[PDB]
From a paper:
HAMP domains are small modules, approximately 50 amino acids, that dimerize to form an entirely parallel four-helix bundle with two helices (AS1 and AS2) supplied from each subunit. A semi-structured connector separates the AS1 and AS2 helices and contains two conserved hydrophobic residues, termed HR1 and HR2. Aer2 is a soluble receptor that contains three N-terminal HAMP domains, a gas-sensing, heme-containing PAS domain, two additional HAMP domains, and an MCP KCM. The three N-terminal HAMP domains of Aer2 (named HAMP1, HAMP2, and HAMP3 from N- to C-terminus) provide examples of two distinctly different conformations: HAMP1 and HAMP3 are similar to the Af1503 NMR structure, whereas HAMP2 has a comparatively distorted four-helix bundle structure in which the AS2 helices approximate a two-helix coiled coil and the AS1 helices splay outward at the C-terminal end.
Notable was the L44H mutation, which generated a CW lock (i.e., exclusively tumbling) phenotype in both CheRB+ and CheRB− cells. Crystals of L44H and V33G proteins were obtained in the context of Aer2 1–172 using conditions similar to those of the native protein. The L44H mutation modified the HAMP1 domain structure while leaving the poly-HAMP2/3 domains largely unchanged. The His44 side chain redirected from the bundle core towards AS1. This caused a tilt in the AS1 helix and a 5 Å shift at the top of AS1, resulting in a loss of secondary structure at the AS1 N-terminus. Despite these adjustments in AS1, the AS2 output helices superimposed with those of the native HAMP1 structure. In other words, the mutation did not alter the position of the HAMP1 AS2 helices, which must transmit the CW downstream signal. In the L44H structure, the tilt of AS1 drives the helices apart, disrupting upstream helical packing and resulting in a loss of observed secondary structure at the N-terminus of AS1. In the context of a transmembrane MCP, if this helix disruption were maintained, it would decouple TM2 from AS1. Because the L44H variant is strongly CW biasing, and the H1 conformation generates CW output, we assume that the structure seen at the C-terminal domain in the crystal is maintained in the Tar fusions.
Residue numbers in the entry:
A (entry chain A), B (entry chain A): 7 to 156
Amino acid sequence: HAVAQQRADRIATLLQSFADGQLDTAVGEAPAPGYERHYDSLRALQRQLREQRAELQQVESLEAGLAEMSRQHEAGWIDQTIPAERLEGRAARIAKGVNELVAAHIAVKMKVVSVVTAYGQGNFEPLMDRLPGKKAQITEAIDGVRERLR
Amino acid sequence: HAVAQQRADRIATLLQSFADGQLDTAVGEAPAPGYERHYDSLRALQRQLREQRAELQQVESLEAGLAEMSRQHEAGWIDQTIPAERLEGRAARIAKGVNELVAAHIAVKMKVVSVVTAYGQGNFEPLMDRLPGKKAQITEAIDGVRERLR
Ligand SMILES: [Cl-]
Ligand SMILES: [Cl-]
Ligand SMILES: [Mg+2]
Ligand SMILES: [Mg+2]
Ligand code: NA
Ligand code: NA
């Protein structure tokens, strides 16, 4: 009678904690045989709430990292990247993905600058890369510059 | 005796479902007064598991969208963007953030191409934007091209 209520209150308290976002309490083992199923599920649920909390926090950090990277680049510090090494899982892969895509565009941009700077110096040895898709328009444009400049 | 066990099994089953990822069952209301706390928490937990599931799915979609955008740009279709409008919350903001940052770099790149293309035609009216930070190196480079070309 007394124990039954106590064990019931314990389960209510643990569930209440989960609901309120208090995931630090250690669930532990069941008090008696008839509560094994309840506790098995409670422990499993807790592990899941903790994992999802961590993953969602990583995403929040990813948004802040992107925000700072954007701020840095608008200020001209284009070497700045999102510190993917400080993230993990999917958040880290997305961060690396953004860094690589931005880096790829910067590389094409600097290639253009490098080639035309040379033409400006009378050095016509360099040729713009042969780009695909819409980027092919850049290749033709720069070739046109070369032909006309000399 | 019979009812007690039945109501206890119901709570075990609901918790078991949550654990296994079956969040579609409708919890409903408590069967008797002494179970109000349990059910209140169960409903709240379910709402949270569903919300976190949705948010994590959005992130998975964000990673795929970035992957496809990267694939498209490497192929030269640089007008392609991550469809942020099809996402929501933080996932959507990150997507828009990536689209804007990439677009900003492309704009600087095309500005460079536009200016030098003009110089190649003997049209020295356009001047490269005055860029900050490390980007200032691009401004000086292109100015140098202008001065030397004419
Ligand atoms: Cl720096
Ligand atoms: Cl297209
Ligand atoms: Mg010269
Ligand atoms: Mg000319
Ligand atoms: Na990617
Ligand atoms: Na941003």
